[PDB]
């Protein structure tokens, strides 16, 4: 068939009873779980490597706001309405600038790395709630709550002089729990695979002793 066409012609002691077959299938399973657990550990390790280093390279700092302002420009958010319905609405842009613990110089605040990447030109984005008036109201609400925060309390912040060279975050975007589960359950798979092999060999060898006893 689709492999070439026409394949170009044709181009190609046993004292234990039946229990032996079930026990050899149990060895197979336990070995396959050992391999699965190790392979999945490496697969998840390669997938988590870049996110985990990009997170580790960002240090904790103490921050204080230098200023809060609007740049007068506006941007599109997308608002949603069931099945696939979406349209766009404007929001006004705030910028916020902040004191920094590693560079001791100006940097622009970005609430989280998704906000930084969805609009790196701007400091905050409202959840899009239909009309422009509600976006502007929600930006003005956040703006007023940030503008009076002057040295009130040095809030902790996250920074990376190598890849966020003048940008600052309020949150870690890397959930430790999700990473923990991604490395724990492959380890559980491996441990269960070892115990299945061990109990199968323990049962198999005790069957011979219980046979020779008779």
């Amino acid at each position: 068939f689709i492999w070439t066409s026409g394949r170009t012609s044709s181009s190609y002691r046993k004292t234990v009873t039946a229990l032996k077959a079930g026990e050899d299938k149990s060895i197979r399973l336990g070995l396959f779980l050992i391999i699965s657990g190790v392979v999945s550990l490496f697969i998840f390790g390669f997938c988590w490597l870049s996110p985990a280093l990009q997170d580790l390279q960002a240090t904790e700092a103490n921050c204080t706001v230098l200023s809060v302002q609007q740049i007068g420009e506006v941007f599109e958010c997308t608002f949603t309405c069931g099945a696939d319905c979406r349209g766009t609405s404007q929001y006004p842009c705030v910028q916020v600038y902040v004191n920094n613990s590693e560079s001791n110089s100006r940097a622009l605040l970005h609430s989280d790395e998704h906000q930084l990447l969805t609009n790196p030109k701007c400091s905050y984005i409202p959840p899009c709630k239909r009309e422009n008036q509600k976006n502007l109201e929600s930006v003005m609400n956040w703006q007023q709550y940030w503008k009076d925060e002057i040295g009130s309390q040095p809030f902790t912040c996250y920074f990376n002089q190598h890849q966020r060279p003048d940008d600052v975050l309020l949150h870690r975007t890397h959930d430790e729990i999700v990473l923990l589960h991604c490395f724990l359950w492959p380890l559980v798979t491996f441990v269960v695979g070892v115990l299945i092999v061990v109990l199968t060999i323990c049962a198999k060898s005790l069957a011979v002793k219980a046979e020779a006893m008779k």
Partner: protein, 462 residues
């Protein structure tokens, strides 16, 4: 060597996630120290293989020498320069080609099928990974005539996925090479990689999964007898045997039937065994093998039945094969009841000289030629008696139809078989004719004979 090849491949896989060229401190980079040690060990293993080599020039041109020249010197240069380039490091994946050879050295791989499977897997995976690394290098560093401006940011795993899609001929088009060198490489790989995939993937899938379905051994059940059947096993032979053995006109016998044959049953025999799922078991083996005889638990079987090929081309060869089977079964267990079919009478005489062949204990050689010629001779004393005798053995139910035809009467007569059982103390002390006229229609039973042992139609004086 086996472990460190995989270690170096994993190190390359780690590095493939970083930028193409960078500065990194040897005294503070555990992966660069580990790579340094791994390449020291490969330099030593290279030196040993060079010393052991017969023709040096032949060795210098062996491809795992070439793989060391293209992977060991650049590690030394990197460790000296305190910098790394992700250049030809994908050639580390070619180290998997020697895995089968060093498994054969370790006395692990012996069978041709396993050796071929390991060779195919190693060649496929190493080719795939190496080609993926080369296309990753070429795509991430653009064309020199375009001033390296048309580079495509492709990850190593993205290139691996693209190569798999291209090899299988699926060609999604979501990921593809865009540089001129990348496409030029894609064109040459399409010629070789598709022929490799189309050839190796079916052959690997054939090599795997070669499992014996009918393995294992019978498990005896306490309180229930079992029977081992061997010799000429085929769909019609088993179907005819099971119709007579399991007929509803016998009493409630629960004797299990175990078949031993060296040919895997076809789909119609497997369906026949599924229709008898609780009374028939089959196990694939040779009756001449004591291991198989122990598997079918022939040491505890009530008897062993050996069917014969009545329509064979060579009656002498069939008789010889049956004689060998009887010899093997008796050699494994002298005290096993053996029922067998023998085509000729001189071969039956040959067989009865076996030291373990005990006709008193119940060894019956059913000679076909003898019994058929005897039945023909009894038809010369009374015509129809061969039909009369043959119908007394085959188990048959009553069949009745509304038509008044000779067939109705014939079938009514055919419904009777010959049986054997012990008879009441209420009939002890009487004459044989008297108990016959008593049994005939009151009990509805006819007696031909009784247990000076076997007496055919006793006189009135007994």
């Amino acid at each position: 060597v086996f472990a460190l090849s995989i270690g170096a491949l994993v190190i390359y896989f780690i590095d493939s996630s970083n930028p193409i060229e960078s500065c990194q401190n040897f005294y503070k980079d555990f992966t660069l120290q580990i790579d340094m040690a791994f390449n020291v060990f490969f330099l030593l293993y290279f030196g040993l293989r060079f010393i052991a080599a017969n023709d040096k020039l032949w060795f210098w041109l062996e491809v795992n020498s070439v793989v060391d020249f293209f992977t060991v010197p650049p590690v030394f240069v990197s460790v000296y320069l305190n910098r790394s380039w992700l250049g030809l490091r994908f050639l580390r994946a070619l180290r998997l080609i020697q895995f089968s050879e060093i498994l054969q050295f370790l006395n692990i791989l012996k069978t041709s099928n396993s050796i071929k499977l390991v060779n195919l897997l190693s060649i496929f995976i190493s080719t795939w990974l190496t080609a993926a690394g080369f296309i990753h290098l070429v795509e991430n560093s653009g064309d020199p005539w375009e001033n390296f401006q048309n580079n495509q940011a492709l990850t190593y795993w993205e290139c691996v996925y693209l190569l798999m899609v291209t090899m299988s001929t699926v060609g999604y088009g979501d990921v593809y090479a865009k540089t001129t060198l990348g496409r030029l490489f894609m064109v040459f790989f399409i010629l070789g990689g598709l022929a490799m995939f189309a050839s190796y993937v079916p052959e690997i899938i054939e090599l795997i999964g070669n499992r014996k379905k009918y393995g294992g051994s019978y498990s005896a059940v306490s309180g229930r007898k079992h029977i081992v059947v061997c010799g000429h096993i085929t769909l019609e032979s088993v179907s005819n045997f099971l119709k007579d053995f399991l007929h509803k006109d016998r009493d409630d016998v629960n004797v299990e039937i175990v078949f031993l044959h060296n040919i895997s049953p076809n789909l119609e025999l497997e369906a026949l065994f599924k229709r008898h799922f609780t009374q028939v078991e089959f196990y694939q083996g040779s009756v001449l093998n004591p291991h198989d005889l122990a598997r079918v638990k022939i040491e505890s079987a009530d008897a062993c039945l050996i069917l014969a090929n009545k329509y064979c081309a060579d009656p002498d060869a069939e008789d010889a094969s049956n004689i060998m089977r009887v010899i093997s079964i008796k050699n494994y267990h002298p005290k096993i009841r053996i029922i067998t079919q023998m085509l000729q009478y001189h071969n039956k005489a040959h067989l009865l000289n076996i030291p373990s062949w005990n006709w008193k204990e119940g060894d019956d050689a059913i000679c076909l030629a003898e019994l058929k010629l005897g039945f023909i001779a009894q038809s010369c004393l009374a015509q129809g008696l061969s039909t009369m005798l043959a119908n007394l053995f085959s188990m048959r139910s009553f069949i009745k139809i509304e038509e008044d035809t000779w067939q109705k009467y014939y079938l009514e007569g055919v419904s009777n078989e010959m049986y054997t059982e012990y008879l009441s103390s209420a009939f002890v002390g009487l004459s044989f004719p008297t108990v016959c006229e008593l049994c005939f229609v009151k009990l509805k039973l006819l007696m031909i004979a009784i247990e000076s042992r076997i007496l055919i139609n006793p006189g009135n004086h007994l």
